[PDB]
Design an enzyme around this catalytic site. Structure first.
Site, PDB file in Angstrom:
ATOM      1  N   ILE A 167       0.855  -1.177   0.000  1.00  0.00           N
ATOM      2  CA  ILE A 167       0.000   0.000   0.000  1.00  0.00           C
ATOM      3  C   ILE A 167       0.893   1.229   0.000  1.00  0.00           C
ATOM      4  CG2 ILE A 167      -2.013  -0.993   1.088  1.00  0.00           C
ATOM      5  CD1 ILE A 167      -0.986   0.184   3.747  1.00  0.00           C
ATOM      6  N   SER A 203      11.900   4.742   0.081  1.00  0.00           N
ATOM      7  CA  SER A 203      13.307   4.368   0.118  1.00  0.00           C
ATOM      8  C   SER A 203      13.543   3.497   1.355  1.00  0.00           C
ATOM      9  CB  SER A 203      14.167   5.642   0.138  1.00  0.00           C
ATOM     10  OG  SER A 203      13.461   6.727   0.728  1.00  0.00           O
ATOM     11  N   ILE A 226       5.506  -1.129   2.458  1.00  0.00           N
ATOM     12  CA  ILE A 226       4.484  -1.141   3.501  1.00  0.00           C
ATOM     13  C   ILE A 226       3.347  -1.947   2.931  1.00  0.00           C
ATOM     14  CG2 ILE A 226       3.069   0.257   5.014  1.00  0.00           C
ATOM     15  CD1 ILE A 226       4.950   2.525   4.559  1.00  0.00           C
ATOM     16  N   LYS A 247       5.195  -2.414   8.171  1.00  0.00           N
ATOM     17  CA  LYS A 247       6.330  -1.775   7.542  1.00  0.00           C
ATOM     18  C   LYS A 247       7.509  -2.746   7.533  1.00  0.00           C
ATOM     19  CE  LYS A 247       8.525   2.704   7.585  1.00  0.00           C
ATOM     20  NZ  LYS A 247       8.673   4.043   8.188  1.00  0.00           N
ATOM     21  N   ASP A 273      10.752  16.112   9.679  1.00  0.00           N
ATOM     22  CA  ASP A 273      10.417  15.600   8.343  1.00  0.00           C
ATOM     23  C   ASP A 273       9.011  16.050   7.954  1.00  0.00           C
ATOM     24  OD1 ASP A 273      11.008  14.201   5.976  1.00  0.00           O
ATOM     25  OD2 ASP A 273      10.240  12.288   6.777  1.00  0.00           O
TER      26      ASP A 273
HETATM   27  N1  LIG Z   1       0.530   6.294   0.613  1.00  0.00           N
HETATM   28  C1  LIG Z   1      -0.787   6.510   1.281  1.00  0.00           C
HETATM   29  C2  LIG Z   1      -1.142   6.125   2.748  1.00  0.00           C
HETATM   30  N2  LIG Z   1      -0.457   4.867   3.191  1.00  0.00           N
HETATM   31  S1  LIG Z   1       1.167   4.382   3.363  1.00  0.00           S
HETATM   32  O1  LIG Z   1       1.094   3.021   3.198  1.00  0.00           O
HETATM   33  O2  LIG Z   1       2.015   5.078   2.498  1.00  0.00           O
HETATM   34  C3  LIG Z   1       1.813   4.488   4.997  1.00  0.00           C
HETATM   35  C4  LIG Z   1       3.150   4.899   5.215  1.00  0.00           C
HETATM   36  C5  LIG Z   1       3.662   4.916   6.534  1.00  0.00           C
HETATM   37  C6  LIG Z   1       2.850   4.504   7.615  1.00  0.00           C
HETATM   38 CL1  LIG Z   1       3.466   4.565   9.145  1.00  0.00          CL
HETATM   39  C7  LIG Z   1       1.485   4.101   7.391  1.00  0.00           C
HETATM   40  C8  LIG Z   1       0.614   3.718   8.456  1.00  0.00           C
HETATM   41  C9  LIG Z   1      -0.709   3.338   8.083  1.00  0.00           C
HETATM   42  N3  LIG Z   1      -1.187   3.330   6.775  1.00  0.00           N
HETATM   43  C10 LIG Z   1      -0.353   3.679   5.774  1.00  0.00           C
HETATM   44  C11 LIG Z   1       0.978   4.081   6.064  1.00  0.00           C
END
Ligand SMILES: NCCNS(=O)(=O)c1ccc(Cl)c2ccncc12
Ligand SMILES: NCCNS(=O)(=O)c1ccc(Cl)c2ccncc12
EC number: 2.7.11.1
Lengths: 293, 293
Positions: free
Chosen positions: B13, B17, B21, B36, B126
């Site tokens: 999703i 870098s 996820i 993650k 950030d």
């Molecule tokens: N890119 C759109 C939103 N989702 S994501 O997967 O990138 C994303 C990145 C980082 C964290 Cl910590 C998340 C936590 C929960 N959902 C998506 C998260």
């Protein structure tokens, strides 16, 4: 806000020239749906034609369910099943290209959807990765590939007599330039073959991450479709496909050589993609790139 | 595939870098989570520091819940609550810009999250729209704005003594060039003020759809941060903000003038955004642009 009597509108999940698309919930059973909103305007393609097409294809595998069509204020609303992201969305998640395995497996499913459309006597005419979406995350068909958006299908043969429409020219260019058949560029009437060729362009795009005719030059909108078309004709198939299994070249080739009213040999095309999986010593499983690490 | 003993991995999703996820499900209670995955490599920022920070901020509004940290093969895995899309994702759905109303309402929530981080003695470092995500579609907090990604926070004052860290220079540039404070560009040590200024840059980006220093010139990576920094200094605030409520200029101004160790006056900043809503004769409701037609 509530539309269609019992449908609640959530947040936007898509926005195109043809309107906005919201996620929503059916208040009766709590099923999740997508609500397409089209502004009522002179030049905008009737949303009712799409609803009719969805009803026509109802019961077909990989075609979402339609639930309601009506008018709400200055908008027409079409309520469909909520789906997952498109194959173009997932490209951004996989490095902007897919592996032969994912392309061959997707191809088989994408090819079955187009055939289903052809068997209902329609030609899609808007083949693009943005229109093939996968299932919702936690459900039975999360790895099923669906086709959506029927705003430009057309009957290619009288549905009852199987009489094929005639070959016409001087047509005005419609869909996305990137994936269209060479014929579409020459202003010729589109048929089954053209859908098959646009899909093959989508397959090579998946494979290479890009096509030779992307981002061309500084000119007007009509010149873009012109130059791209010339490039498509100058790029030979063995070069476009160099480096991937022969089956891809064989596909592009078959598709480009079909005669205007010829019935495609879908089983041959499907077998091609099967040979590809055999050679990689793998089966058709649900191990698409977006499920892998 | 199953990680952390009882967590099933779904599809990607997100991909950055810092890893990939995946969406997943906890097999014990069936709660949806985001997993993650960080590859274990020399230069990669420990994912354990992020888990520690999440635990530190646990219980804070708008900070997701963390559930597990461990190693699985060549990867470190952090399991968080599943969230909705980012404010950058939603920009693509709303024409690439937000209305004053949505910016002022989001600002108030984004400002409360940064303050919460500062009160735990950390500076975010950030700040970017990609890091503020909203709730899941069908849930209680679908219109709550969350902060995620703590790979580069740092303590700006000893947590127990409240002693502020000293002013250092010759620092190496870290985060996204587009939104960083002018100080970050001059290689100065980042503090509360810098977070506040990067947020103000994000606010103007929401408002204008773009910033004056976007897409600069043909040069190397270090030259990009250099030129952008010069542009940031040449663009006067009244010009950057021309055309929107004074409150935005007042915010950029306050943020840029704070002294290195000064405690920001959060209530003033929050009141600013309130005046903005008053003037539009509206309240702080859940009518964000992405919920509207
Ligand atoms: N890119 C759109 C939103 N989702 S994501 O997967 O990138 C994303 C990145 C980082 C964290 Cl910590 C998340 C936590 C929960 N959902 C998506 C998260
Ligand atoms: N853009 C990613 C996938 N979703 S979408 O909103 O664009 C989208 C466009 C068109 C139709 Cl018919 C849909 C149907 C179901 N879900 C999303 C649909």
């Amino acid at each position: 806000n509530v539309v269609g009597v019992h449908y609640k509108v959530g947040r936007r999940i898509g926005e195109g020239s043809f309107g906005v698309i919201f996620e929503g919930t059916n208040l009766l059973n709590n099923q999740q749906v997508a609500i397409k909103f089209e502004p009522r305007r002179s030049d905008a393609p009737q949303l009712r034609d799409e609803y009719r097409t969805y009803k026509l294809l109802a019961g077909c595998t990989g075609i979402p369910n339609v639930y309601y069509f009506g008018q709400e204020g200055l908008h027409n609303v079409l309520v469909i099943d909520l789906l997952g992201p498109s194959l173009e969305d997932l490209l951004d998640l996989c490095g902007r290209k897919f592996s032969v395995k994912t392309v061959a497996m997707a191809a088989k499913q994408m090819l079955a959807r187009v055939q289903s459309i052809h068997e209902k006597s329609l030609v899609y005419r808007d083949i693009k990765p943005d229109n093939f979406l996968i299932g919702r995350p936690n459900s039975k068909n999360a790895n099923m590939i669906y086709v959506v958006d029927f705003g430009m299908v057309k009957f290619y043969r009288d549905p009852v007599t199987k009489q094929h429409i005639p070959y016409r020219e001087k047509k005005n260019l419609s869909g996305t330039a990137r994936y269209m058949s060479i014929n579409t560029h020459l202003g010729r009437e589109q048929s089954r073959r053209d859908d098959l060729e646009a899909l093959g362009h989508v397959f090579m795009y998946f494979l290479r991450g890009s096509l030779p005719w992307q981002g061309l030059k500084a000119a007007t909108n009509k010149q873009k479709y012109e130059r791209i078309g010339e490039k498509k004709q100058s790029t030979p198939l063995r070069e476009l496909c160099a480096g991937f299994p022969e089956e891809f070249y064989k596909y592009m080739h078959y598709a480009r050589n079909l005669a205007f009213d010829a019935t495609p040999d879908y089983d041959y095309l499907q077998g091609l993609f099967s040979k590809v999986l055999e050679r990689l010593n793998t089966t058709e499983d649900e191990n698409f790139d977006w499920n892998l690490l």
